[PDB]
Design a protein around this ligand. Structure first.
Ligand code: SAH
Lengths: 83, 114, 289
């Protein structure tokens, strides 16, 4: 019973865990939805660029360095994976 | 007919199940999770999720395995950072629980909401 | 068998094993190994037992060893239907959920936090390992206080003509509140005959029948120890308290207040008000106000 949108594959407890790491004590139920949408929004930008470098290089395979380059564009550099 | 039996009060006292008060579990979670450094989201669902969304932008994208875990970490910290400041918005209104109207407000002040 | 060396023992064992069927020699380990037996789950079971039947708090049944050779410890369990735990003497296995868990009160298995003290059960020697119930069974002084009846650490008493009526009991040494005192020994007799003997008792105003549980009454008229002569008072320095020991129901006495040398002992016989006037009407009290 897994055939659906994979966004719901992000289980509610997984969110509950992340709020803890950010130090959030108490969470209302309505948070679980926009967090999905907000996170959803975040992917849209990064992959679009990530796709762009790959197809510009004519490559059909998304490689690791393509990720950091796009992440660098949004003002969030990523140490640890190349460059 | 019953004789005058001497007797003593009988009892049936039994142990009480133990439940922590609300919140103190979370405080224990905060310290253990802040100390902890591993990723929190189940590993498998992301690989399906990225493949699903990427299919919209283009078709037939084989994904390099190393490139995968990056998205989680980048998204995780972004989410984590987006979370902590939400508390400051929440505590500012003297509340303790966060509601989505705050996460919207916070994403505005950074400027990303627009 | 010193009559034979190891040869002709093994050889006759060969002869016997050739004649008789070979032994089973079977071993088991059970699915459960560790954990998955949090004692709060046991708290649920007694919570069930309390809510269905033990909420009555009047049908005290003597322990009976329930036998389950192949049955589980189901609702048909004699201990279960008896509203009581399965003892280690029961055939319910080492995985029965009606057995007692073990009485791990660290300081002394002796107080309100002690579930065993909260229970009617004395902390068994094999269970309250934290109060030394098993430790130094030969020795007399232990950390625990709710382990005495097993060891029978009775106090020394004195027999004297009581001020109230006839013979009475006096204590030799000072004691504090809630301190163990000598047991109320006697003989086992059923309720119906307790009526007959009690029926005989009322013809001469005697009372030596004690309602041990819903199913039995103890008598000390013919066999017993010295404490049987204790008098009655409505404001006693001592009180009676039923207790559970090793599947045996017993009644002990404890000091309702701290007590000094040479006191006279009293406890409430707890008959009816009309009955109290019938037998123990003497109160020996002056009114200060
Ligand atoms: N406070 C009291 N006043 C009058 N009789 C009492 C009494 N307490 C106990 N008894 C009587 O004593 C009997 C218990 S056996 C004790 C006998 C008494 N102590 C004596 O030596 O004379 C009961 O049958 C009861 O009838």
């Amino acid at each position: 019973k897994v055939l659906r949108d994979n966004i719901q594959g992000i289980t509610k407890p997984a969110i509950r865990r992340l709020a803890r790491r950010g130090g959030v004590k108490r969470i209302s139920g309505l948070i679980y939805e926009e967090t999905r949408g907000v996170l959803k929004v975040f992917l849209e930008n990064v992959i679009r660029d990530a796709v762009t470098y790959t197809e510009h290089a004519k490559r059909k395979t998304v490689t690791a360095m393509d990720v950091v380059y796009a992440l660098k564009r949004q003002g969030r550099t990523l140490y640890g994976f190349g460059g | 007919t019953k004789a005058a039996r001497k007797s003593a009060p009988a009892t049936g006292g039994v142990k009480k199940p133990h439940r922590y008060r609300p919140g103190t579990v979370a405080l224990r979670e905060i310290r253990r999770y802040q100390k902890s450094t591993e990723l929190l989201i189940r590993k498998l669902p992301f690989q399906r999720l990225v493949r699903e969304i990427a299919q919209d932008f283009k078709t037939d994208l084989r994904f390099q395995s190393s490139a995968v875990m990056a998205l989680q970490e980048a998204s995780e910290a972004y989410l984590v950072a987006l979370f902590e400041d939400t508390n400051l918005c929440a505590i500012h209104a003297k509340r303790v629980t966060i509601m989505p109207k705050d996460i919207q407000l916070a994403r505005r002040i950074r400027g990303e909401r627009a | 068998i010193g009559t034979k060396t190891c040869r002709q023992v093994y050889e006759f064992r060969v002869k016997e094993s050739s004649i008789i069927a070979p032994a089973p020699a079977e071993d088991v380990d059970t699915p459960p190994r560790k954990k998955k037996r949090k004692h709060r789950l046991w708290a649920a079971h007694c919570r069930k037992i309390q809510l269905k039947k033990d909420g009555s708090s009047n049908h005290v049944y003597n322990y009976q060893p329930c036998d389950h050779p192949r049955q589980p410890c189901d609702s048909s369990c004699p201990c279960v239907i008896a509203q009581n735990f399965c003892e280690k003497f029961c055939q319910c296995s080492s995985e029965c959920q009606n057995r007692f868990p073990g009485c791990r009160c660290k300081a002394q298995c002796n107080t309100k936090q002690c579930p065993c003290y909260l229970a009617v059960r004395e902390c068994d020697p094999d269970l309250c390992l934290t109060c030394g119930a098993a430790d130094h069974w030969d020795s007399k002084n232990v950390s625990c206080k709710n382990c005495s009846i097993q060891r029978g650490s009775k106090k020394h008493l004195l027999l004297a003509p009581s001020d109230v009526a006839g013979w009475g009991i006096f204590i030799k040494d000072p004691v504090q509140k809630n301190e163990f005192i000598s047991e109320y020994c006697g003989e086992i007799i059923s309720q119906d005959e307790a009526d007959r003997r009690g029926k005989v008792y009322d013809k001469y105003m005697c009372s030596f029948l004690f309602n041990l549980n819903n199913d039995f009454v103890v008598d000390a008229t013919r066999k017993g120890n010295k404490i049987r002569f204790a008098n009655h008072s409505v404001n006693p320095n001592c009180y009676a308290k039923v207790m559970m020991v090793n599947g045996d129901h017993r009644i002990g006495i404890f000091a309702k207040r701290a007590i000094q040398t040479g006191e006279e002992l009293f406890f409430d016989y707890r008959y009816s008000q009309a009955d109290a006037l019938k037998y123990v009407g003497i109160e020996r009290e002056m009114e200060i106000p």
